Amino acid sequence: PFITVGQENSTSIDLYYEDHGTGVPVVLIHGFPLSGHSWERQSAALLDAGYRVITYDRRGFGQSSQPTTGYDYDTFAADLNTVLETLDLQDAVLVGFSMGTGEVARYVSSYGTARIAAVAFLASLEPFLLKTDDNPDGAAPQEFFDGIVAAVKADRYAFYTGFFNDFYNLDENLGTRISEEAVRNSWNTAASGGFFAAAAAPTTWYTDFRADIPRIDVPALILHGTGDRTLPIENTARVFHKALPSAEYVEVEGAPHGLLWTHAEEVNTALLAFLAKALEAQKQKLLTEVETYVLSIIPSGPLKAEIAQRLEDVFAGKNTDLEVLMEWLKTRPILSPLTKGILGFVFTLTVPSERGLQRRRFVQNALNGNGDPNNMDKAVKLYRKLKREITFHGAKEISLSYSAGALASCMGLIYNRMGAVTTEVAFGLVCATCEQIA
Amino acid sequence: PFITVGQENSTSIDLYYEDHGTGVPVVLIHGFPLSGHSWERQSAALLDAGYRVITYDRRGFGQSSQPTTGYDYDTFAADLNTVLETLDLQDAVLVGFSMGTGEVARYVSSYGTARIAAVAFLASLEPFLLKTDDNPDGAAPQEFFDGIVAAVKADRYAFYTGFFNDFYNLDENLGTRISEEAVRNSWNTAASGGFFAAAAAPTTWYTDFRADIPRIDVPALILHGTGDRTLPIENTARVFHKALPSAEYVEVEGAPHGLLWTHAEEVNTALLAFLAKALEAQKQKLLTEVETYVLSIIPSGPLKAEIAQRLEDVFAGKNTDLEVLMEWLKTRPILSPLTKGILGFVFTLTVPSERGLQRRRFVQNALNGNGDPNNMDKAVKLYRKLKREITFHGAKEISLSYSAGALASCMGLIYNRMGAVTTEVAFGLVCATCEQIA
Amino acid sequence: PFITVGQENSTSIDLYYEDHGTGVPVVLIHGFPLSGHSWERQSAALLDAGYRVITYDRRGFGQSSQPTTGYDYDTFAADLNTVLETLDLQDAVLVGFSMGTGEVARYVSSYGTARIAAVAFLASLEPFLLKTDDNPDGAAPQEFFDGIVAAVKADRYAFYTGFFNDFYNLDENLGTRISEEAVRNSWNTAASGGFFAAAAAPTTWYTDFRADIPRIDVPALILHGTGDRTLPIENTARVFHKALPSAEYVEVEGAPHGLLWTHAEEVNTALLAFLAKALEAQKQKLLTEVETYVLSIIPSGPLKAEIAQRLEDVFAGKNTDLEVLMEWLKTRPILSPLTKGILGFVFTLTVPSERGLQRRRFVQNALNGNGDPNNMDKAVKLYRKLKREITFHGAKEISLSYSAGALASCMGLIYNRMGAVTTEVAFGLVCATCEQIA
Amino acid sequence: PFITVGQENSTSIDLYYEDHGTGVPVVLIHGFPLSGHSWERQSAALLDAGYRVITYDRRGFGQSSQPTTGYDYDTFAADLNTVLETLDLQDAVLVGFSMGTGEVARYVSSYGTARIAAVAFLASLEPFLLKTDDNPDGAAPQEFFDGIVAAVKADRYAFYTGFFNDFYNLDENLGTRISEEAVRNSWNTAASGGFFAAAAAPTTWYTDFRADIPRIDVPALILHGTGDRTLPIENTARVFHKALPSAEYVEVEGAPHGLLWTHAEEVNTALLAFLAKALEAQKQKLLTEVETYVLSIIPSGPLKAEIAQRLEDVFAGKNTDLEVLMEWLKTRPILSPLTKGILGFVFTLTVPSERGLQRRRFVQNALNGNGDPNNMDKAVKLYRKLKREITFHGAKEISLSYSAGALASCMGLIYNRMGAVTTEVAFGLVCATCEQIA
């Protein structure tokens, strides 16, 4: 999986990325000098929680292309933008690490937060690393950073082992927090990067982000270890906390720089606690929107009120048995068969506790579609567009074109254990079919 | 140089036209019975001011073909329409004289004002010369014009020496305002015209232009000699003034009908003043709306005030150097490369005083954007459409159906070698680009 | 080289694969946690034997994509089916290893054996690894496999060194059967796999294949090690032998799990012996079918019996003098010049006795084609169609749609070393020319 | 970035290549068993000097495809030819190492020197490694190389740690000239190659390059380590020196075989010095012949002495400003506008120090010349031919069949936006233009 972001000479600067899981998109940006695979402990906990994980490799690092141009944060942000535009992500979360936090703060400032719901800064560079007469809160003068760039160009392979010692604090963490095999992969990941990228990237560490911080309007999370070597805490996060008081501030006690692996228990705990508090407001907004499209089919009366509460208890998570429900749903005087099917459909997508034994006939004949071959031949063409679809905003848009007949049969395909798509796009088909009946 | 505007049996009807200078196109349309060479004093000052002068000879007059058909303003306007379309003039200016003032009002009424920026009626026929019962403000009954046609048919050549005698007021202006030799050449221009034209043209003088006046939605200029013997001012310019009060009204005192030569020092003064104001207004009206679109791409703050000032200063023509701007624009904290390439692309257009030097490098790098195989080749698709588009709204509408990655790439093509198209069409892309990124 | 076998979100699940050599397609399916390059010792043996090696990487492992969906044998077999169909293989032999033996039995029991000639099971998973009350032939209860997954999730990179120590039995083979450099490479491939793929794979180890075994209606090979630490021989092959008795049962003495590298000599010898014992019956009644068309051109008499022995004493595997035949076929009264070049061509392919010199003349003058450009331009048309051909039937079905005169010129280039084909393709041409003489 | 160079059954053979920087193209070809990343020190100095670095990985090695066919220098040269043609490199430089030095000699012999300006053989195989009876100056009998292939087939991975041990002389250079980590990565690059490649490549070492040496008609550089254990200097570089005495000969004392890393400070010094001289000679040799053509368009006198001096001063790189030249060229008594447009077109090319400013106005006006409908459109016909032409003589021959009015117009197109083509092709037009006007 590759996304093109640039064009160097006769080649195209392509970036490696991975799009896993279904739900709220969480974009992860790695640090120097690793790949997107470095988030393998965080990506694990984000998948079990239900989030959609998207990790991409920075140019010159990992499996991405290795050009000798475009090594400033204006290019690094222009790449992140192209990725978000190509993926068409909406209300996503940007989580950065090391250099990754430098793109999270630059993109937000330069392109806005129309696609952003929340951000996070793990072991950040912000606001400034370079120590000048202007900024005393710097970590080191430019002579120091020029000492690193030269030390890479001499022998970048021998430079890595020294760097990955101040990355994990191996004299304290090896054999306890991190194994030597785990370290080896990090070296293998770094050594398999672009030689030019390894020598040009350190010149971006001392970037002035003081102008980009105020442009953060979305909820933010700031995290940093108290034993960081590459990025001293009192020169970064401690003074990042004063620049943006709106963000929650978390110091992991005794954590090194590469705290993504060493303190995975601590990081994942805080990262999930932040997301489930800053995304809860929008994650249920669909549940009341899906409820809206569903209720716009039910004829007004005593039924419409109880049905709406059979959606409230279910969407929330209250215990509801289907047998009393589905029986009751069938024997209805004013409900047309087609609505019985949609309700029977939605009531199965939202609960994993249907006992997994029986199916219903009143819905199965409702989501039939008469049995017309042409009507079925279009329904599978929709499912084809839905099996390669991800978002609710996209599944509804596509399934609003096809006729009301093909929509019924397409819902049947998913319901009759034939086709299979995520519950987020399943609502899309439902809410699109509901707009047809309006 | 000729332009085919029709067909007459075995012969084609061609019109002699000339094209001079570079700048805002000014179409000069002559009157009876001269040719395009009668503007040789107005066509001089317009060239010294920086305009593009275009003179064409009406059918049957000058070096143009001499057919015996199509001697009516419905045909004359079609002739003008063909000339304008063939030359593909955009935002041009129509200036007519005597009969030529009828081809200005008829064109705007029948064909529109997409190619027209401003018009001018010098010694005009408007609105109606024929003195009827419903039109009291005429000049003479049809028994008079029928006398002129009969007078020409008897002796065309002897008729001229009496016509030019009142055309210039040679009992008042000869050997003073107009030389004897100047008259002789004007006589030669008359005698070298179509014999049928000189007999058919006078019947086109009493054409009702009251159906064409309201169609005028552009700045106009009504100038007329006070001592016009051939075309009474009290029966034309005075009543024409009421029909179109929006027009700048000017009366040259003591001027005859042929005031293009005798009073060239007054006509040139007024015509240049009108053009240097009315066109200046359009270069300001449709320039402040560009700033509006540009100031939607820039985040709120001092940068939305510093750019705003530097735009309003540049628009006002305040003397400044681009090398201060182009450098200060570069070293800017918040702005992304894209909106740094858009601003630079505007500063190169709105500041003709470019020190007579090169282009820039950061705008060239930001504009292309990715250079995607189809997206860059969808920029050359729009490049073929904008070269044919003539308006600002037209350029805005088409480019609004294209992606911001395609618009930026298309702007990259225009910036390199312009142009082709005009600035009013180039701004149509910039404003459309800014409208997309929002 | 890649093959799209699915679609996860905005990414396409592609599998890496290789295709070398000419002959019977032998598919090699690796196991946990290596890749297709682990068969490198078997691939070298199969290419020299005269086979066609096709290795591919399982999803999430090796050089293929690393998705989070589709980790079950129903999905693993769906990929295998797509690879087999995309390549359009026929008479293909399926060989598996560890986790790769499960894809062989599952595909064969759901998609049929139309493209399959034989199967092989090295270090099998069959028939059941999980130990319940239903079968004592299980390896370990569910509580054991949960320990593995938890160990992978803890430290994926540290898990391998403890897994590869029991994979090759390094307390027995290190420094002898396998060097530490070979271990490091096996680790480098396991580390470059998928993070989700390495933890969701052991849950597929205890898949029940009992309902897939009787579906195997092709010659099989059940090979195992008597020192396997990962897959206990008593719980796998020992009981697999009872569910599949008509399969050649081979127990490599003292062999570990990673016997592909340690006991490569013992495996290759046993694998090649099986590939000959299973494919001999099909080469017979094909080589005799080849002879059938060959003897048809030979006139029924005392010569049609002699040439029968001259063929059957070469098809078997015996050696002979090329000089004797090419002088006994040359100086012959009854045979036509064309059928001399035909027998001279069949012999030149079925004989290993090169003697290392010059190439016959009479066959050149027989397979000439009159030196006709039109007839010889039709000859290169078949060559381009035969160079892309595989089966014997596929060659005969195409070489029969040409004139018999053109086939001679086409058998000229293949003879004159100007063109190269396989063995079944070459005979497909010859046995087609023989059909056109009836 | 990949380039297809062949086809292998179901898979395509693609080669991984990289393109960096702008300037004179330098093709770097690696050796056994590394990849293009082995030039990361030479590829650094070349970029800092202003060259275009192109590294491609040989088949079976690096990230390129791993087929089992075409492991011979006849195929390797075809691979190089395909890469050069696909990239359309003109006047490039070929630099090879170990095996790579064989692909330089084979290309020049089989394909020519139209795209090649200079070559370099670093630690070369030339002329013949195999020690035969007719070739006393060999290195080892075939019984030796057959021992290496057998050594690799046994254990490919364990073989490397012994090969790299002598490749770098790690008993002399380890932890000093080359780090331990630098070795480990080189081992990873080896282990990640084609298994069949590592067994087939050593058989290509003893290739007779005596049939390729005389074909070299370009400046060459023979550099070799004195302490090369793998490739003896006395059996290669010494005898190779006699076969090609025209080449600049350099011996680095105490350098092993992998002197690209251990002695990068010596190789970079020599390679840059050779390139900055040999290429400088071509930029002077084929520049003085331009002056010869230019000084045939200028009448004899002081102008044929003042231009001659100002040309020879500019060619010599003497610091001067164009605004003195471009103005002094303008105000010149004898010269016609055409030969004033040709001179200005040369001064813009031969003086890169253009103050970083604009173009000129008199050359733009004189070059187009008439703009004849067919003659200007016969300039775009030549513009399509010169973009494909690669040499100086080639550009001269084609444009010699066109009129001077077409050549001038074609020069007008190149001057506006160059380019596309190179200066060696642009001069091919200028010299052809001057040749016409005579």
Swiss-Prot record, chains A, B, C, D:
Q: What positions constitute the catalytic site?
A: 98, 228, 257
Point out the signal peptide segment.
none
Q: Which family does it belong to?
A: Belongs to the AB hydrolase superfamily. Bacterial non-heme haloperoxidase / perhydrolase family.
Self-association and partners: Homotrimer.
Provide this UniProt record's keywords sorted from A to Z: Antibiotic biosynthesis, Oxidoreductase, Peroxidase, Plasmid
Q: What is its EC number?
A: 1.11.1.-
Which Gene Ontology MF annotations are present? peroxidase activity
Supply the name of the protein: Non-haem bromoperoxidase BPO-A2
Q: Which domain of life is it from?
A: Bacteria
Q: Does the keyword Transmembrane helix apply?
A: no
Is-annotated flag, keyword Oxidoreductase?
Answer: yes
**Biological process, per Gene Ontology:** antibiotic biosynthetic process
Role of this protein? May be a chlorinating enzyme involved in 7-chlorotetracycline biosynthesis.
The record ties this protein, via InterPro entries, to: AB_hydrolase (IPR050471), AB_hydrolase_1 (IPR000073), AB_hydrolase_fold (IPR029058), Epox_hydrolase-like (IPR000639)
What are the AB hydrolase-1 domain coordinates in residue numbering? 25-263
Alphabetized Pfam families for the sequence: Abhydrolase_1
Please spell out the taxonomic lineage of the organism that makes this protein: Bacteria, Bacillati, Actinomycetota, Actinomycetes, Kitasatosporales
